[PDB]
Design a binder for this molecule. Sequence first.
Ligand SMILES: Nc1ncnc2c1ncn2[C@@H]1O[C@H](COP(=O)(O)O)[C@@H](O)[C@H]1O
Ligand SMILES: Nc1ncnc2c1ncn2[C@@H]1O[C@H](COP(=O)(O)O)[C@@H](O)[C@H]1O
Ligand SMILES: [Cl-]
Lengths: 134, 142
Amino acid sequence: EATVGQFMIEADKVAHVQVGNNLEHALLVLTKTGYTAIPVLDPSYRLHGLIGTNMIMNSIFGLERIEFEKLDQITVEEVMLTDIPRLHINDPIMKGFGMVINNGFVCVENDEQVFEGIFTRRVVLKELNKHIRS
Amino acid sequence: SLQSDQLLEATVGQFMIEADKVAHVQVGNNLEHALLVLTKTGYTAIPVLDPSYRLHGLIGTNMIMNSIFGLERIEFEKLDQITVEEVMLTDIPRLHINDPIMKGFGMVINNGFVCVENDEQVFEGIFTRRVVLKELNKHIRS
Ligand SMILES: Nc1ncnc2c1ncn2[C@@H]1O[C@H](COP(=O)(O)O)[C@@H](O)[C@H]1O
Ligand SMILES: Nc1ncnc2c1ncn2[C@@H]1O[C@H](COP(=O)(O)O)[C@@H](O)[C@H]1O
Ligand SMILES: [Cl-]
C-alpha cells in the first residue's frame, strides 16, 4: 500500500547540520530556517542525531545567566539527541503514522543506513484530511 | 469516549488542551521571561495573553533569537529590554471553542498547534497536531 518513502520530504529538501559543527552554527541555521529541530549528518550522509533550539538553549544555562558566548565552544554532537526513531523508505505509511504521534518528524533511511528524508506530521495530516474528507 | 460515527459532530473545545494546562506569557513580559518559559517547558511557541486573558499572539524561540542576533555577538542585553508584544506574531490562526472539529483538523496541517478562544478572544486552550494524530490513530485502527 502507501509507503513512508512516497510521502516523506526528500533529503535534498531537508535542512541539516554536519557533525563537528558548533552550536553557534546550529543555532544560526535553526534561526534562519525557522525550524525547531533538524538532522545531524556526517559527510557520508549518515544520520547521527537531531539538534533543536530548545536543546541548545538548555545546554548554555549557566550558574547566573544564559551563556550565549559559550555556543562556539560546544559541538553539536555533545548536545544532539541520539535516541531517535528511524523509518525505512519501504515501511508502510501506517507505521510512520504511529511514530509521529509522539515525534514531530521521523528520519527515513535506506538499506545502507543513508539518510533519505523526513516523515513529518504535516504530510500525514494532509493525507489523512484528504481521506477523511472523501 | 466517542465512537467513530460521532467524531465529526465534535467540537474543537472537546479535544483541546485546556488553558489551565497551557504555558503562556503576557504581552508586557520581557523576552528573557518568555525564553525561560520556552526553554523550561521545551515548547516551540506559546500563547501571549493580556491581563484580561485575551489572546494577542504567539511567541517562539526563533522570534526571540531573530531579535537578538547581532552582527558580531548575540545581543543578550536586549532580552531584558524588549517586551513580548514587540516581537510576537499577531496574525495567528484561531479556533473558537465551539468550532467543528474538522476545522481544527484542517488548520493543524499547517500549524503545530492552534490557539482556541471563547467569545471576545478570551483564551481557552490549544488544539495540537498530536491531539489529532492520537484520536485518528484510535479510529483508523477500527
Ligand atoms: N525541509 C525541512 N528541513 C528540516 N526540517 C524540517 C523540514 N520541514 C520540516 N522540518 C522539521 O519539522 C518541523 C515541523 O515543520 P512543519 O511541518 O512546517 O510544521 C520543523 O520545525 C522542523 O523541525
Ligand atoms: N501545555 C502546553 N502549554 C503551552 N504550549 C504547548 C503545550 N502543549 C503543547 N504546546 C505547544 O505545542 C508544541 C508541541 O507540543 P507536543 O505535542 O507536546 O510536542 C509545543 O512545543 C508547544 O509549542
Ligand atoms: Cl508538530
